[PDB]
């Protein structure tokens, strides 16, 4: 099968946020009838004073927050809490419709000739590439035995029947 990788050169970004403009614009209904950076599937983490410019793409949906949130210090830069998470998470507004709260997820401009965010980034911080990768039931049994060992066979049995 083919996996597509979004290549993001944070060192090339200038924080124009053009990507947010075109992405939300296209996904309007009808297309380009309006725009709204809050509805963008790509969001730029921007702090000029910290020299941080990090384009983030909408990833997976999650119904619950993490028990602990992560916060990095890398190469002198103090990033934001959850600074790199692509999740549509109940802990913030990113990757969620500003009016309904519904989750947003990048689909690489499915159907279109080219990712619009990539196209409007005239400085070339963004590119998408492809590559092929290689795609048993013994894993199931071991996991179930793991679940029985950690929580108990009586607890496991009653949960499955629900």
């Amino acid at each position: 099968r083919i996996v597509k990788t979004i290549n993001i050169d944070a060192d090339k970004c200038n924080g124009c946020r053009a990507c947010e403009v075109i992405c939300s614009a296209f996904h309007a209904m009808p297309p380009y009838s309006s725009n709204n950076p809050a509805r963008s599937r790509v969001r730029v983490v921007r702090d000029p004073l910290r020299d941080i410019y990090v384009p983030l793409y909408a990833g997976e949906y999650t119904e619950s927050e993490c028990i602990g949130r992560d916060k990095f210090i890398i190469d002198g830069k103090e990033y934001d809490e959850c600074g790199f998470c692509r999740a549509s998470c109940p802990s913030r507004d990113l990757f969620r419709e500003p009016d309904s709260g519904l989750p947003l997820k990048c689909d690489l401009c499915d159907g279109e000739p080219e990712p619009l965010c990539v196209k409007w980034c005239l400085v070339g911080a963004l590119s998408v590439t492809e590559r092929e990768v290689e795609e048993k039931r013994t894993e199931m049994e071991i996991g179930l035995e793991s679940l029985i060992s950690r929580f108990g066979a009586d607890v496991v049995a009653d949960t499955v029947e629900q």
Binding site: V21, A25, A28, Y32, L49, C121
Partner: protein, 653 residues
């Protein structure tokens, strides 16, 4: 329904703490487009001439351009308008960055401030949510420093903040408004903001912004981007670096400043150093700049990245663009290192990087001459650099001699006396000009110095080359794809134009040709400042992606109003005349429209009189600079003509 614009504005009374959203008249849009144009309409019939700058009835308007918030590349400018405490005329100031588009996403086109707040406060906007917050804990804080504290307080990391420094709070006549890598710098609009007890304006927006013709509007947008690529592969041949490409003066990218340091005047616009740019200097400045520049950053939805984050050792990071890189350096006879360090202090304080440097150099000339004594400067340090840091703090606090210098070179010299007016030699309408004292009279720039409502030369020029090509082949090549011209005659003028001989300045181009050129260049700036389009992609650089031929299409598809080339030309003329009428009502006459006496060494009175006479005719004004009743009625400015007669400004017949 409305498009491009939101159709709503905010009316804030800082005296009563009242806030009100009001729908706008769609007719205003058809006549004055937006931004500067509609700002002018508001100031005209709400701010009579009897209103003083620091009077509660004075207005402070924050306007987002008509096309801000749309996918239009580079369209992100804010237009701040008020009555200047320095010039006593109208003052509109432009600011880049991300603030204007955020306002549109919040649902508003303008914010109009009246009255004054007794306590220091800031305005908080979040879509439909609008409230006034206390800002006493922010007193004295720097402009950028203030924004970061607020965004932590409110927990709004993605909110855009426009704030003033201590300079604005203390009503320095050349105090600015700072927002990230952007500044409403000139006119003293920061002084009015502080006078109203308004520390900052915070806005967050997450609403949609619509256009009338979606497919058509994005089409023009892509057309611009494509031109920007092609244009950046074909810079203007044989021009200097910071004039070959698009955008604002790319002085943060180019280390070469030979044209600047050898043609512009150092100190109080005084000294010319013909041979300053040596090898030792060029290497020392490049080293300082490589070490100080962290990243080249852009404004909202623009690939040009003109600004740059500047990090000096032991100092907080600030952002810089264009000519402020040299003004502090050249005014103090120092180096680029000193300039970058003091600019950090000045940006935080919120001072104009043009006037401030000239005011301090003006003060030291007076101290040098003996017009000012050492007793006026107590505890004055020895070093030249230390003296500027010293005087800077004295000004922002209005402390002693700093209280007088805080009024500008004009008013300061007026108060000082003893021949101090002689050293205020670089003012037009009480406003400091660019430090340029050239040799031969320039017929095109003469007009721009005399009539420019912004009273700044860098913000009226652009579309016509500043100098002619020596060889005819170069000209033919240039006019080949010069599609931006309104008329073929602009090509023919540049073809005949030569640096030396029978077709050189000041006698060529002719008086009629000069008037047409000045009218075109000015028209593009007024279109920019109404739509919100950054001049860097329009009226400033040669052969821009935005021009008189596609602009009408952007307006039509974006706002959903009928618009063509001629109707657009007339529109720009309409509120450019209205701005003129505003200054006429405030006492401006032809007498005020003269360059500094020493601006050129070779003057031609008879040619200058013919130039100003002919230009007035083209504009449709009097021989005293006043818009006639005929042209006012033709423009749909009949109410102006009536009030002129009623006020005796114009005679009936």
């Amino acid at each position: 329904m409305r498009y491009a614009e939101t159709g709503y504005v905010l009316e804030v009374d800082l005296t009563k703490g009242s806030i009100e959203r009001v729908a706008t008249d769609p007719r205003d849009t058809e006549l004055y487009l937006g931004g500067l144009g509609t700002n002018a309409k508001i100031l005209w019939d709400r701010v009579p001439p009897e209103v003083e700058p620091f009077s509660p009835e004075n207005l402070l308007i924050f306007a987002a351009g008509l096309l801000c918030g749309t996918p239009a590349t580079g369209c992100n400018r804010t237009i701040v308008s008020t009555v200047s405490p320095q010039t006593k005329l109208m003052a509109f100031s432009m600011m880049g960055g991300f603030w204007a588009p955020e306002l549109k996403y919040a649902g508003y086109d303008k914010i109009i401030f009246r009255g004054k707040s007794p306590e220091l406060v800031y305005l908080y906007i979040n879509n439909d949510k609008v409230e006034i917050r206390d800002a006493s804990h922010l007193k004295g804080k720097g402009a950028i420093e203030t924004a970061e504290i607020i965004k932590k307080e409110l927990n709004e990391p993605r909110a855009q903040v426009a704030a003033i420094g201590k300079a604005g709070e203390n009503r320095v006549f050349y105090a600015s408004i700072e927002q990230g890598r952007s500044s409403a710098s000139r006119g003293g609009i920061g002084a009015v903001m502080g006078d109203k007890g308004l520390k900052a304006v915070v806005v967050r927006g997450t609403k949609d912004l619509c256009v009338a013709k979606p497919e058509e509007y994005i089409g023009l947008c892509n057309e611009v981007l494509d031109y920007i690529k092609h244009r950046e592969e074909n810079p203007i041949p044989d021009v200097m670096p910071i004039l070959a490409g698009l955008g604002s003066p790319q002085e943060m990218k180019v280390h070469d400043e030979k044209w600047h340091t050898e043609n512009f005047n150092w100190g109080n616009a005084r000294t010319r150093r013909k041979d300053f740019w040596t090898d030792e200097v060029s290497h020392a400045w490049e080293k300082t700049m490589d070490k100080a520049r962290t990243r080249l950053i852009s404004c909202y939805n623009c690939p040009m990245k003109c600004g740059a984050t500047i990090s000096m050792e032991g100092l907080p990071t600030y952002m810089m663009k264009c000519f402020t890189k040299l003004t502090y350096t050249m005014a103090a006879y120092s180096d680029l290192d000193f300039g970058l360090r003091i600019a950090q202090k000045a940006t935080e304080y919120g001072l104009d990087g043009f006037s401030a440097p000239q005011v301090m150099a003006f003060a030291f000339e007076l101290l040098e001459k003996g017009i000012l004594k050492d007793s006026d400067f107590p505890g004055l340090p020895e070093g030249n650099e230390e003296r500027f840091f010293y005087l800077l703090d004295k000004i922002v606090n209005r402390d002693g001699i700093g209280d007088i210098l805080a009024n500008g070179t004009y008013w300061a010299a007026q108060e000082i006396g003893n021949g101090a007016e002689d050293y205020a030699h670089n003012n037009i309408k009480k406003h400091e000009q660019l430090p340029l004292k050239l040799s031969m009279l320039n017929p095109i720039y003469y007009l721009m110095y005399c009539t420019g409502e912004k009273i700044n030369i860098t913000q009226i020029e652009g579309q016509f080359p500043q100098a002619p090509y020596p060889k005819l082949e170069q000209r033919e090549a240039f006019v080949e794809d010069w599609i931006q011209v309104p008329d073929e005659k602009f090509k023919k003028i540049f073809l005949e134009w030569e640096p030396r001989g029978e077709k050189s300045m000041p006698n060529f181009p002719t008086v009629d040709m000069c008037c047409d050129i000045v009218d075109w260049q000015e028209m593009m700036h007024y279109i920019d400042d109404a739509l919100g389009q950054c001049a860097g992609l329009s009226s400033f650089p040669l052969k821009p992606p935005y021009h008189i031929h596609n602009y009408p299409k952007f307006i039509a598809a974006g706002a959903g109003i009928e618009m063509d080339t001629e109707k657009l030309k007339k529109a720009a003329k309409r509120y450019r005349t209205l701005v003129r009428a505003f200054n006429i009502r405030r006492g401006m006459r032809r007498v005020d429209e003269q360059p500094p006496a020493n601006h050129w060494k070779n003057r031609f009175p008879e040619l200058e009189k013919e130039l100003l006479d002919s230009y007035y005719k083209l504009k449709g004004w009097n021989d005293d600079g006043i818009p006639t009743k005929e042209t006012l009625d033709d423009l749909g400015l009949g109410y102006v003509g009536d009030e002129f007669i009623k006020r005796g400004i114009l005679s009936a017949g």
